[PDB]
Amino acid sequence: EHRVLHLRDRLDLAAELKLLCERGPLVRIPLEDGSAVHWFALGYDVVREVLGSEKFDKRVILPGNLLQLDPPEHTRLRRMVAPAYSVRRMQALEPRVQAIVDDHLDTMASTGPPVEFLREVAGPMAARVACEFLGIPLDDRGELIRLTAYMRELAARLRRDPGDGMLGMVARDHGADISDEELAGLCAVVMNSSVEQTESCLAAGTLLLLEHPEQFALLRERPELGEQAVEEIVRYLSVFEGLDPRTATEDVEIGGQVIKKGEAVFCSLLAANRADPALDGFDITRKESRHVAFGHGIHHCLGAPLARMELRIAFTTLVSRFPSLRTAVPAEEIRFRPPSSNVFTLLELPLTW
Ligand code: HEM
């Protein structure tokens, strides 16, 4: 439901969604059947207010899925996996991620144009980086990726002999405290939803840079803009458009209005990142980005350090190795997935150079 929160015009907001945002950053939505009262959180500040509040849970209205947990059990599991995303860990991983990116751009430059960038480059790249971060053994990566019992069997086996990566760390440091199913669940979230979001950022972000050739070249002239460019790209794309509802556990005042106990709040990251026409233009020279593309609060994207590193490496290397890159069809013909709660993405991206 609430399909209006996902209406777009290519990468931008649809007029119907812009009109909704004019009703304020916090919109009360009583259901027509009188079964519940829902809320739309559409503004940057209000979305952060909701997501930072302790007075909401993620009740429904799979083991190892942090998004389906509330404190204290959410805290318990997240604290065990968080060290895998430390700065020290990303620094040690960076050169290997660079090499994986180079592997896939090697394949791309050798196949010669054209290429379907989503299936042939972005997808495999994201899945291979995920395998490296997780520490998947080499002989299991091909099958694990093809699959996008096996997971439980894989998790139990790697749990017996801890290796490298996040999965080895967790099992090595929290062997008895995490089960096979929970480990498998941590792996699945990384290999499934996470790759979907990352691959979409890679493909749609490449399209976004191609539609702004001045900045495509600027990122090549000044690769130090990579970190800034990533923040602007994830803000502009908002591939994770809307969040699971947050239900108020008690009466709480948000954005000047009282959200009653039991009412559900739907945060629109898309609206929060894009509704403000001031400072909405795509501009990678912006030194600081105002966005909630990775969420906020206790459920803030645990993989943001990896996503930010991988995307920086990918975009900077791409613009450098393919200065002549261009869409093989007019940009206006690219197909985007119709409105849905699923990750936002294009369906294919034919490129040549
Ligand atoms: C490297 C790949 C990624 C991995 C492994 C990853 C893993 C996660 C995990 C495990 C959570 C749940 C945290 C919790 O509930 O405590 C999470 C939350 C989130 N991730 Fe990431 N993520 C990754 C890349 C992204 C990307 C590319 C985006 C979009 C730009 C993204 C947008 C989010 C959002 C919006 C949430 C919060 C959902 C909510 O609060 O309801 N993630 N991510």
Distances (CA, A) of 180 to 68, 171, 264: 18, 10, 33
Residue 198 Cα: closest atom of ligand 1: 27
Q: How many CB atoms lie within 10 A of CB 102?
A: 13
Ramachandran angles phi, psi of 331, nearest 5°: -55, -35
Residue 121 · residue 115 · CB < 8 Å: yes
Q: How many CB atoms lie within 10 A of CB 291?
A: 16
Find the angle CA(122)-CA(216)-CA(95) to the nearest 5 degrees. 50
Q: Could you tell me which residues come within 8 angstroms of residue 41 by beta carbon, excluding any fewer than 6 positions away?
A: 25, 26, 47, 49, 50, 254, 255, 265, 266, 267, 268, 272
Q: For residue 16, how far is its CA from the centre of ligand 1 (angstroms)?
A: 27
**What determination technique applies here?**
X-ray
Q: For residue 302, how far is its CA from the centre of ligand 1 (angstroms)?
A: 6
Ramachandran angles phi, psi of 265, nearest 5°: -115, 125
Does the C-beta of 201 come closer than 6 Å to ligand 1? yes
Residue 285 · residue 225 · CB < 8 Å: yes
Residue 26 · residue 257 · CB < 8 Å: yes
Residue 81 Cα: closest atom of ligand 1: 10
Q: Which residue among 194, 236, 247 has the greatest number of ligand 1 atoms within 8 angstroms of its CB, and so is best to mutate?
A: 194
Ramachandran angles phi, psi of 336, nearest 5°: -110, 150
Ligand 1, atom 21, residue with closest C-alpha = 301
Number of domains in the chain: 1
265: closest CA among 296, 292, 244, 251? 244
Q: How far is CA 42 from the centre of its chain?
A: 19
Q: For residue 303, how far is its CA from the centre of ligand 1 (angstroms)?
A: 6
238: closest CA among 290, 191, 288, 186? 290
Which domain does 39 fall in, by range?
1-353
Residue 65 · residue 74 · CB < 8 Å: no
CA-CA distance, 93 to 131, in Å (whole number)? 12
134: closest CA among 168, 107, 87, 178? 168
Residue 234 Cα: closest atom of ligand 1: 30
